[PDB]
């Protein structure tokens, strides 16, 4: 093998290089590169890869929704809840050093980190009808505080909820104030939930807090055979049929050893 | 039937290189020898030479040897000739020709339809 | 739904394990069809060598 | 009752509950869900139920 990754049939490939794919698709303020990504042929990530989750916590699920990655060729991103759509709750307040962008304190891109707005957090009771033609990507969080002092701090309520609900979701939340150590410097936690959104169908979010909300979700505009590569291998800027994590395969043969 | 299908019209500058596949489709021809014979405009047949895959034969002319490499692929059913150091005496019209046995003394039956190459 | 990957494992195990008993089903007839063959004729043969 | 509970206690199922007073979508014309639950019961072993 010539050690480098190819475009399969054509297709360049997603190459997150030191993102992951949570922070791909959460839209981490380190991988504004990938915030419009046209159609891939596989993913490419890395082992160990810096730009994961950068304010600490989970994404769950994970690897169901990396298992739906091996079958989804194209995102087209599309901000089904506009900034505008909280007037009555802060979204600009909502940054962490966890997250910088340029040295200055940020957010992930696709979710909103509401905050109490006027001293005030009234309940948020939204729905968002899938009026496209394919499947909805959708991926919302909570914030696990770390003391009723915060919790205050931030969302005025001590105990709050969350719940979600569509046709075949049914989800009840509710923050673990707890005392964690510091990971990434934050003490507090992201528990980051996802759901595929069929069409004609309405997902309906209702918190009083610890909302992180949907901005932007992911329209699935193609289907078909991928895959994620752990990869290292630097891009070759050249195609091929066959391609191993180590480097693509140009031959007819009926073996190989090179990947499993 | 087997019929041998071969790749494009080629386009070349003096002094680059082409190489003309000829893909056996319908049946393997891997048991048979493919001949690669090109014709001048205006001049006759030429032998440039063959491979016979499985029996592990790849004969080339005189007059082309240390200038033509003829390579088959067996997986692919798939006869190549890369011709290098072309000049204007180079261009005609190729054409890969499976015989009637293993080896070169046979007729050749079945022919392909053709490459021009024009060196300008 | 939320079990795809333990499904695709599933799939791919009892496809792999069908695959894996369908060549050794093939292989077997074959390479028995080829020793059948040439022990027919090692048969007549070896006829011919004894009454020879 | 605003806050009610589902208590199922066995020899080896501990379960305690809360419905999830939600707004979802419409299926089969209605907006409520029903979670079932099942348990295998041994003999000599009894099953308490205890809800408001
Ligand atoms: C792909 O095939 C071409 C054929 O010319 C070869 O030059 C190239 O090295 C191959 N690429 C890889 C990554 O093996
Ligand atoms: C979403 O929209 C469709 C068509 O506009 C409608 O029939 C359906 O009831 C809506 N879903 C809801 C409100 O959950």
């Known amino acids: 093998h010539n050690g480098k990754l190819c475009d399969l049939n054509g297709v360049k490939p997603l190459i997150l290089k030191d993102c992951s794919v949570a922070g791909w698709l959460l839209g981490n303020p380190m991988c504004d590169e990938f915030i419009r990504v046209p159609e891939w042929s596989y993913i490419v990530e890395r082992a160990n890869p810096a730009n994961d989750l950068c304010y600490p916590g989970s994404l769950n699920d994970y690897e169901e929704l990396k298992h739906m990655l091996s079958r989804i060729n194209h995102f087209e991103k599309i901000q089904i809840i506009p900034k505008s759509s909280w007037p009555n709750h802060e979204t600009s307040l909502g940054v962490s050093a966890a997250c910088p962008y340029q040295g200055a304190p940020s957010f992930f891109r696709n979710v909103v980190w509401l905050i109490k707005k006027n001293d005030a957090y009234p309940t948020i009771k939204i729905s968002y009808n899938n009026t496209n033609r394919e499947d909805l990507l959708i991926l919302w969080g909570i914030h696990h505080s770390n003391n009723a002092e915060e919790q205050t701090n931030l969302y005025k309520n001590p105990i709050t909820y969350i719940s979600v609900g569509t046709s075949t979701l049914n989800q009840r939340l509710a923050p673990k104030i707890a005392t964690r150590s510091q990971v990434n410097g934050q003490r507090g936690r992201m528990d980051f939930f996802w759901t595929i959104l069929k069409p004609d169908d309405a997902i309906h979010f209702e918190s009083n807090g610890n909302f992180i909300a949907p901005e932007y979700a992911y329209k699935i505009v193609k289907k078909g055979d991928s895959t994620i590569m752990k990869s290292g291998v630097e891009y070759g800027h050249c195609n091929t049929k066959c391609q191993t994590p180590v480097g693509a395969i140009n031959s007819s043969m009926p073996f190989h050893n090179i990947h499993p | 039937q087997v019929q041998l299908v071969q790749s494009g019209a080629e386009v070349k500058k003096p002094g680059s290189s082409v190489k003309v596949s000829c893909k056996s489709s319908?049946?393997?021809?891997?048991?048979?020898?493919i001949s690669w014979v090109r014709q001048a405009p205006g001049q006759g047949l030429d032998w440039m030479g063959g491979?016979?895959?499985?029996?592990?034969?790849?004969a080339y002319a005189q007059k082309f040897q240390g200038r033509v490499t003829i390579s088959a692929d067996i997986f692919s059913n798939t006869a190549y000739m890369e011709l290098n150091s072309l000049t204007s005496e180079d261009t005609a019209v190729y054409f890969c020709?499976?015989?009637?046995?293993?080896?070169?003394?046979?007729?050749?039956?079945?022919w392909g339809q053709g490459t021009t190459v024009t060196v300008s | 739904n939320l079990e795809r990957r333990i499904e695709n494992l599933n799939k791919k195990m009892e496809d792999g394990f069908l695959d894996v008993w369908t060549y050794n089903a093939e292989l077997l007839v074959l390479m028995e069809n080829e020793r059948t063959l040439d022990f027919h004729d090692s048969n007549v043969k070896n006829l011919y060598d004894k009454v020879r | 009752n605003p806050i009610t509970y589902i208590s199922v206690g066995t020899s080896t199922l501990n379960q305690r509950l809360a419905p999830k007073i939600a707004t979802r979508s419409q299926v089969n014309g209605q907006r409520g869900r029903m979670d079932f639950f099942w348990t295998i019961l041994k003999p000599d072993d009894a099953i308490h139920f205890e809800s408001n």
């Open positions: 020709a499976r015989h009637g046995n293993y080896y070169y003394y046979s007729g050749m039956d079945v």
């Open positions: 319908g049946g393997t021809s891997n048991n048979y020898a």
């Open positions: 491979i016979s895959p499985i029996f592990g034969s790849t």
